[PDB]
Symmetry: C7
Subunit: 137 residues, 7 copies
């Protein structure tokens, strides 16, 4: 199932990094196999309610802890092909005092990289770029 | 079921982009078929509680990760036909220091495009336009 | 059931726009019929748990995506007959830097329209009007 | 049951407006009768799970949409008999730039009315009055 | 059970006002009796699922509406015996522009009362006092 | 079970105050005994669903009301042994206008005590210290 | 199971501190053993619903109390190998008035340590570093 999940992720373009793709495929295959095993165990008579409750609590806690990571990942997925965030573009994110200006040099799954006028590297989170006023110059 | 969902989305006007319409139709058809298959499996005696719990946890996590995307999409759906956000209109979004001014050039499902006095392109999120004071001039 | 829901909405005054009333009546009739059909299917032995879980997840996601729309609609419903927001009244919403001033020209289910001293049209969301200090002059 | 709910609301002082009291009594009687009918239907064998799920989803959505209305109503209920918010009192709500000053002229279930030095009428929400620094002069 | 709940509340010091103690005892006794009655009804065969769902929805809505009241009550309970908030003490709550200064004159279950240099009475919510920088002078 | 819970809390270092330790041990023993009694009652045939629903609603409301207290307690637990917050250290919490400066004199489970240059005592909540920029001098 | 969990945590790199690794292994082994014991008890006929409800409520309350700790831990896990946060690097976190500048001296699982121009030690939370504009110089 790992190969199937890797193929699905590669085809859909959700995940592009090979290491991240392998990790996600392993995790998804393990989760699906565990769910199938729990269903099979519950079919024959074993009470799966405590196991389901514990697994659900652990999964909810883990997903709530990784909220920012997930949000940044989704923002990076959505913003792809924006036609305004490209290499060499002079973009400006923010309005008012909280303003960020620079030239796009690289894009990541967690940060958007800009080069300032003084040569500094600016790490703008993708979630910040999503919920802000991007100014293309 | 893909054709039925595509027809429903096209008729209701919820989704207009053909690629987005096809993707949404495929996803909805797959989800409905999976729910029907799970119900059929649970009818004959298979314990579907672990599968339901896992699918619900995954769906909740995915929907919570795409919160901003969904909010922007809904805002773009609602704001359609505003009679104030039209091509060539001089609108101004915001009050105080966080102010954005320009002329509407194009509308998207994720951003509202304005042209500044200096010629810059402003990408205002639809969610920002919804919960703000739009000033038509 | 569509006619019954339309009559109920018209009598209670919750919805006034005929197009919105027809859409809401259709949606409510479809939802009630679907719930009745699911109950009937579950009576005869079909396991309705996966269908209920899927429908609940979809409904929760849709309702959470339309949070701002629902809030604005409820605010417009509540603020009706305020005796202070009337045509020709000089109202002022907000305190401090985030201040909005104008004369009320029209009311909508999504925006409150004011005319500035310079002639601009101000679109103040109803949710903003609810949770703010309205200053009648 | 409408008369019983009206008597309970009048005696407890939760609701004072006769129209609001009648509406709340009707709604509560209808809800209790519906719950009793659903329990009776489920006793004889009818699967009430889809109906319960649909009713719960609708009630949760409605209650979440009316969050601000409910909060203001509860604040108005709690603040009653404050001994500081009385007719003719010179109160001041807020600290810093977001300050509101005036003389109390009337109290409502949604707004607190103050008269400014220039004669303007200030509509301060009860929720704002609850979570703020009231300054009695 | 009303007397038992009154004794428990008085001994634990959670509630000190006799009227509030009587109201809380009545409410708790009614709730416990209702839960016992529902359990007894469900034992003999009556389907209690709709009643439980309705009661839970109503209780959740009521508890969410009284969020600020509950938070202030808990803050007043916790802050008791602070050794810094005493009669005649010159305390200062807040940092920056949102600053409040005065001498403590009285304590309530909803507000903390201070006397300003000009003689004004300041009503500082207990929740504000909890999540702020108290400056004892 | 009270002695067992007291020993566990003392060994793990979660709770250090003897009065708080005794109260927590009593509460935990009562809760565990109640859960065991409810399970035993449900084994013999008594429908425990209404009792479970009522207890869960009450516990959720209580835990949500004590959110700030719990957060401060957890922050005090985590920050222990920081090697930067010690007696006599000149620390500075905050950035910008909301800045607090002083010398650490004492630590509590609810506040962090600092002595200002003018001799005032500053009560900084532990939750504030956790989510802020501490500046050791 | 403690050794298995320790090996898993060490191999995945989620936890690096040996004391934290041992504590997490003990906690995970205890939780899994408890879930298995509850499932076994529920298989033979014992009603595990009250125990599951109590354990779930306690776990939810504990996880919600440790929200900031979990968020900081996840941020520290994610930010590892940033290639911009290294020893001796001159980084600047924040935009506007809330700005922090210094040279990285050490990294922790709860704070990021910077040395100011005046020699002060700055404790920047990892969650703050995640959701901010890092400026590498």
């Amino acid at each position: 199932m790992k190969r199937f999940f890797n193929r699905f992720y590669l085809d859909t373009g959700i995940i592009a990094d090979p290491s991240q793709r392998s990790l996600a495929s392993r995790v998804s295959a393990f989760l699906v196999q565990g769910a199938v095993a729990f269903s099979l165990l519950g079919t024959i008579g074993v009470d799966t309610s405590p196991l389901i409750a514990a697994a659900g609590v652990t999964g909810a806690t883990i997903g709530f802890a990784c909220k920012d990571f997930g949000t940044n990942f989704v923002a990076s997925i959505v913003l792809s092909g924006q036609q305004s965030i490209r290499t060499g573009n002079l973009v400006c994110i923010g309005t008012g005092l909280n303003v960020v200006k620079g030239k796009v040099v690289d894009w990541d799954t967690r940060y958007l990289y800009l080069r300032s006028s003084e040569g500094h590297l600016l790490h703008v989170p993708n979630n910040m770029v999503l919920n802000s006023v991007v100014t293309w110059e």
